Design a protein around this ligand. Sequence first.
Ligand SMILES: *[C@@H]1O[C@H](CO)[C@@H](O)[C@H](O)[C@H]1NC(C)=O
Lengths: 533, 539
Amino acid sequence: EDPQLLVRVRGGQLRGIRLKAPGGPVSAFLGIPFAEPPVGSRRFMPPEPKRPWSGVLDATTFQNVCYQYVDTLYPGFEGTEMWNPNRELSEDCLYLNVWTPYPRPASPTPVLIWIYGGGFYSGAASLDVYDGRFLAQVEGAVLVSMNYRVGTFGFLALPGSREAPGNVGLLDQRLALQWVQENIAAFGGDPMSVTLFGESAGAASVGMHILSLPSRSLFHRAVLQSGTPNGPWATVSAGEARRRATLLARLVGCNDTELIACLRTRPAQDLVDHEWHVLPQESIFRFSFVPVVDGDFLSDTPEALINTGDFQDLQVLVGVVKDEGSYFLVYGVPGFSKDNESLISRAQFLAGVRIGVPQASDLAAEAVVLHYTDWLHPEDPTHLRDAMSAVVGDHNVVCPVAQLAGRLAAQGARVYAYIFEHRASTLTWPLWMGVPHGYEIEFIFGLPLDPSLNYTTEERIFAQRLMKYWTNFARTGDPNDPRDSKSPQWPPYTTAAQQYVSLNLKPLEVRRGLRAQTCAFWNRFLPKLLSAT
Amino acid sequence: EGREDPQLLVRVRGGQLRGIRLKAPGGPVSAFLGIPFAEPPVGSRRFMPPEPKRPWSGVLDATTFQNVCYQYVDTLYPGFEGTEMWNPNRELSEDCLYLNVWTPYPRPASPTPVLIWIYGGGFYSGAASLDVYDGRFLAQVEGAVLVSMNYRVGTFGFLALPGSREAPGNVGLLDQRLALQWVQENIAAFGGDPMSVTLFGESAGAASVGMHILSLPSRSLFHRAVLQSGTPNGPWATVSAGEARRRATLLARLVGCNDTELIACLRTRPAQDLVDHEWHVLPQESIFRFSFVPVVDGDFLSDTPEALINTGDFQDLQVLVGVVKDEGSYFLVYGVPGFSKDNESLISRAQFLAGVRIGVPQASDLAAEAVVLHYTDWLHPEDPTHLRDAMSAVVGDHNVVCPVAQLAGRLAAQGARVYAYIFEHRASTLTWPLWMGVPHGYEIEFIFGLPLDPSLNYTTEERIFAQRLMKYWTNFARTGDPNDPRDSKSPQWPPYTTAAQQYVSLNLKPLEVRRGLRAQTCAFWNRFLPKLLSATATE
Ligand SMILES: *[C@@H]1O[C@H](CO)[C@@H](O)[C@H](O)[C@H]1NC(C)=O
């Protein structure tokens, strides 16, 4: 019995497992419970802390993935499959994973906490792309990741009700955050240096912990990759949540208490079966059950709160990939497929715009078309395709990121911004997709260092640079190597100069303006256009 | 006659003319200046369509320029050559309607293709007798026959109570048409070829050329057309019948006045009282808007220019159109607070927003914001230098470049052969400041070949340049193609097409071909902005 794999937290004793990372061993403790299983009558409710346990809990295996939709679009395609749950689905899924250096760090080590994305309708902390051994081994990080309820289970809300208050998904997260506070010191972790990082819906989640006071005592720095609390997709009004919760309850056979009661009787697959039939329009990049502006967790819209927050003792690193939009086009936009080259007609392009910006008025959609049309090549199908991609990425990720960076820096936060520009040599999608949403993650988490993964060698070198920025960021709130001249340096994003770096195989290059003209359209003009229908 | 010079006496349908032997740098030209082509539109004829000139007796002396049409004189920079060059240079008068002719000396053997110049001046000023419109050079160096006419500007030429008998509107255009007819009847006596007539004009003249293209009765009077920095479509060249009626009425009031009885009173007003007041009838504080312009009468203009270019057939037509680099800088200096010819005009964001409301006076609050949004550089939204130049572009794009782009597009698509250019050379002898770039109106002097006059102090490259321009222009008059048929070594000037949207740059360097006339930005003005209207409260 290896005493390096024996740990004692407030709940009892855990045995982890020793794992091989290319250049060493790591202690790993997987499937640690941090909540009483949110099942039966617990469904839709705030999580309660796990009761203590006898003996030695076996923590050497990933626990069950929270009950969620599973993608069938491209059945057995590596590209969509890598996101799909890789353990058994179950409502009983409130477990978290810790990775540490083996042997347990001697001095308290910065803690990175990873929040998976997945549209607020999917995701699990057990996917290979979230494998923490590399950062633990190479950078001596203590790295934590948790599961949190998704879909109806995590985000169905009857605002005001006692039994479905909304936001329980984020409460699951918050609870895991408390747990890290209360227990991480025992794995060598420094509860006084906790950096959250997450991607997409996970970046939004991190964003919400920033914007919710009770969360703020639980971490010190945040990294939002390719997602924001602000923007078109990450929240809903309490009215629109009440509307969808009712619609779904009608859809499956069901005053508040009585209604939530009946939903509690339905098998999980029945809710997931109808989850997606409640979107107001035919959308892409728009999700049925998401964090709701409840005036509790969120006291006001994210935009309200980022416009008026005080963020002085905050450091944030934020970023996007070169081709945020491409991924989403094959999931709802006619003319787009991973198998051809998705060259489209002017017609399909106007069609694609009413879907990407599903909430647009006729005139607003015309404006989008006019802005993205290349009037030298107004009918060229390569441009039309590439443009469609940008409309979707810009609207949902890039511009919301630009706005978040700008509002944070202006209100005292220290901000670093990036754009990730390297396309994996191992990528299973077509070239026209560029560098799609989600494919920086494998690099940040250090996957290329696993030789059997068939990544090139410059990619392994690149992976180490990233692990370095991210972990430096976690140590110090500055991604720059603290000793090591000549880089050049990664400057803080500011409203004045608007600088951010490209992350690719070449050295850091500083650029100014994150699609500034185009984002002015989305962040400034577009909203006036509609606030006058 | 008897002792006279035999090569200077010509007969026209009106009677006998004695012209004058002018000196050009390379030799003599024949000039016939101040030939009357209409009855004096005076007294009871004020506001009325020109009546053809009754024949006279004896030999009419045609050796000097005649009167300039009664007009407002600009006094922003009193004494400054940059503004005085445009000011009237012969006496002001309602007896006004005269044209000029320059021909080689002696006159051409075979019939020579004719150029007709139509001056601009906002439809409230201009004269064919200005030095920059001197046809002595094109006549001498290219062998061209050049004609230019005075036409009524301001109230006298454009005040209208649409529908009425006594002030139908557009009579300034009719002065112009009457002179084209005159060229048809008479240009043969000078060696002109009535079957080869090319109109060209600038700014408001350009728009007039445009309106002859769009008006059936004018079409039989010319064959090709050049529009320099102006179009018939666009926000300033025309007004609705209602707007024209409203401006006419207001102006009547301001000077103390059933249409008949109202016009009668207008006809008793001294010309100067009308000039002193015309500028007050504008609806908003604005730049690049003029009180009295062609009205859409359902007559000279059957429909709006926008409508007519969007439909008409233009198979028979060849057209050359273009713009200067900095169309709008000239205009800021007149009426946008922050701007001057005497400092660098660095402005603030506030002054920019203010300037947009003035430069785009018809704009609802939203449309104006759309403009500021498009033109702001969001990396440096506060930068005085960037703002200064953006304000210039806003005015230049809204008034010349995008209407011109619009027009090239529609004409090309409707079977016209179109050639387009942007003129990018700043005259070495310009009295405006560098910030203004190459301003509105300052290519004219190169097209007319003034730099060939050694006394004018242009550079040698500038002399060679001007001749190049004169070749393109005359070649175009001649053949409907600016390109030199002989010298095909030097780069060629492609037609502008819907597809490739090719135009050339005119500067000291040889032709360079470019694609897209401010294409992204003109999509905003020509497509989005209209739709963005979809509001009720302005006017
Ligand atoms: C041009 O140059 C001469 C000699 O330097 C000068 O006297 C004259 O006034 C100048 N004329 C013009 C038109 O600039």
